[PDB]
Design a protein around this ligand. Structure first.
Ligand SMILES: Nc1nc2c(ncn2[C@@H]2O[C@H](COP(=O)(O)OP(=O)(O)O)[C@@H](O)[C@H]2O)c(=O)[nH]1
Lengths: 263, 301, 297
């Protein structure tokens, strides 16, 4: 993530650029401008059709340097992070402006509040479990919607389906959930819509891309259970795209990742 | 006796009327209507009709509608003078979805008792399809007299375990036929109790929004159990309760009992609304030997 | 010392014959199976060792009336042919699905013919479903009544408790083999014994003169599959005084064994009597059958 707390998540400062796992150097929000902001043509976009922006708001240029990627071609949807309550008024003062161009020059954004992520863990955590125990959720809004095209499985979804509903959609939330043992797919879908993260606003939206993962074990009958919980669930006149995923490291778990759009 | 001409519009219909043919389904005449002429090469329909000048019914029911209409005559020659005319399909796409409201409408204008036997999409089959299907079902109901609908959703219970997609629509391939088989055999292969075309006419006529269930069994009280399950078939949705019009049929071997017929029938009417009009029908089918089938058809609400 | 036990199992009426073929297909051995029925349609389709036509063949749309007078008639009418069929048996199981007619009223006869001959006679039968109507539940209680006073031992199993709506259609015709597990529940101890053998004579004491009995199985590895059987509602929880209990286990291989044995007696009045046993049925990996018959009241 193009940020002094968004780099440390993916799995201007000199000692930060040199930890990017795939194979400048002189540093506040506006730091991303004459240390970060490079040319008008830096995607002459080449080898693929999307990449994501994991540039939240929990460090350095995650505010003034985040929307450097937003105007990159004014399709890409950023998976951000609104700051915790206790992380000061100064980081909260960098809230709207650090997201404003991420929802004026960028396609769509998924404003994952770690404030609300208090319900994901055990009881108490730390600042070190705000870019670690909030990587799990931070990958979700990404991985949820990549896996439909990279690794589908028992059901498939086009390139043009995601990019035909999640295109320039601006305001967007998600909602995730997990389950093992019986009822798996409907247990986790009923977690997915009730998860303190979609802010109970799916019914207001007009376009939802439900994902659902698990082994190749994953029955065709389980998938039909979750699918129903959507036709009732969202506005009864929306644009919904289902679709499945294969991940055989889950075995018995089924990663039901819902994503919202169309407010 | 009676001229039964089964028509399978849609790709799903034309695919399902093949299953009919590859099962025998006597006393009918098969007609496959679809847009991509290519797809009709694989049909074993005795008659095949092509309805597509240009489409490059590409997921748009309104092509299918127009297609059905621009071949309004082609069909009204295929359907001329025919006591019983069926119009099975897969609602969801376009060729069926749009068409059936015509082919059916055409049979009905031709005075032929017209029975629809269509399916609703799996909800995994996307959300568009549902809505496509949904106004298309509203379209038959308002066109053909009876419309047995079979929600696929319901077809896939947990007692059909790790299935597939081929197996899925194959599970439907049987079920479409079953709402046909169990109305036609009455007329086309009546066993000990005759129920002539006329009877089915009066129960089916004007009814609509019909449902159906199926149950086979054997052993002690076989016909009770085979009937019991059909009553409880999820494919009905607790509807038996209130159906003012019920068509049953206890298809079994030549030597099927009266005591048997009686107490399976007597198990149906009791579920049914107590005012409900009812009809027995037995059918001779040797492929069972030791077992019996039962196909209650709730109709009118 | 000719270790041979002559064990036969007759399936009377559709219920019995159905059940006997379910026994044939699921691979019970060491036993002559017998199908007796009124319709010769279903007899020729059965794979029973010896099939017997008793009922007068009846014109289309009669016969199938389910009047246990007519079944009782049919066997008493062909009582000779039944006497020879079960002649020099050692132990004769008698299975049926009560409520009906032919099996309802036919079992009483065949059971009581095994008795005069001098077999250990056993009745493994079922009480029809509650939805089948009052006439059958009536017609069953009388056929049960007779068979209780014909067989040395009778195992009655409600097909109503054997259900617990959509897919419990495959909870009668694939749940009736409770009858089968009822039979091999005793048979497979003598015919295919395990690491603890318990021959015919062990059984002859703990059955001859009981009258009434009940059963329950378990699937499994054997540590956690043992409780399963006694607790199974099928047994009516009537292990607060089952005065004469039998128990069996099937698979590969003492610790496994004594896991369950260190439990059995902890149930009913242990002043009575219990018999253990073992079976070699290599048709099952981690699974091991844990059948428990509970006689004597
Ligand atoms: N019974 C049956 N249903 C099918 C088959 N293939 C697909 N379906 C279902 O029927 C629906 C209708 O599609 P279809 O009739 O092929 O589209 P159309 O030919 O353009 O009307 C689909 O959404 C599927 O859920 C099949 O072979 N048999």
């Amino acid at each position: 993530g193009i940020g002094g707390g968004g780099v440390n998540a993916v799995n201007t400062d000199a000692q930060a650029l040199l930890m990017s796992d795939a194979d400048g150097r002189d540093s506040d929000p506006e730091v991303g401008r004459k240390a970060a902001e490079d040319a008008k043509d830096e995607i002459e976009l080449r080898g693929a059709d999307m990449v994501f922006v994991t540039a939240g708001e929990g460090g350095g240029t995650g505010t003034g340097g985040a929307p450097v990627v937003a105007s990159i071609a004014r399709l890409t949807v950023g998976v951000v992070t609104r700051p915790f309550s206790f992380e000061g008024k100064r980081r909260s003062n960098q809230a709207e402006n650090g997201i404003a161009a991420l929802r004026e020059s960028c396609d769509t954004l998924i404003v994952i509040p770690n404030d609300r992520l208090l319900q994901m863990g055990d009881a108490a955590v730390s600042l070190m479990d705000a870019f670690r125990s909030a990587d799990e959720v931070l990958l979700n809004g990404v991985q949820g919607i990549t896996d439909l095209i990279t690794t589908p499985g028992l059901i498939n979804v086009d390139f043009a389906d995601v990019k035909g509903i999640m295109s320039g959609a601006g305001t967007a939330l998600m909602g995730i959930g997990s389950a093992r043992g019986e009822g798996r797919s409907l247990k986790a879908a009923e977690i997915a819509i009730n998860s303190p993260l979609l802010e109970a606003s799916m019914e207001g939206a007009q376009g939802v891309l439900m994902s659902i993962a698990g082994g190749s074990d994953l029955g065709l009958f389980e998938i039909n259970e979750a699918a129903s919980l959507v036709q009732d669930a969202a506005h009864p006149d929306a644009n919904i795209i289902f679709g499945t995923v294969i991940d055989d490291s889950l075995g018995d778990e089924v990663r039901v990742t819902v994503i919202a759009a169309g407010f």
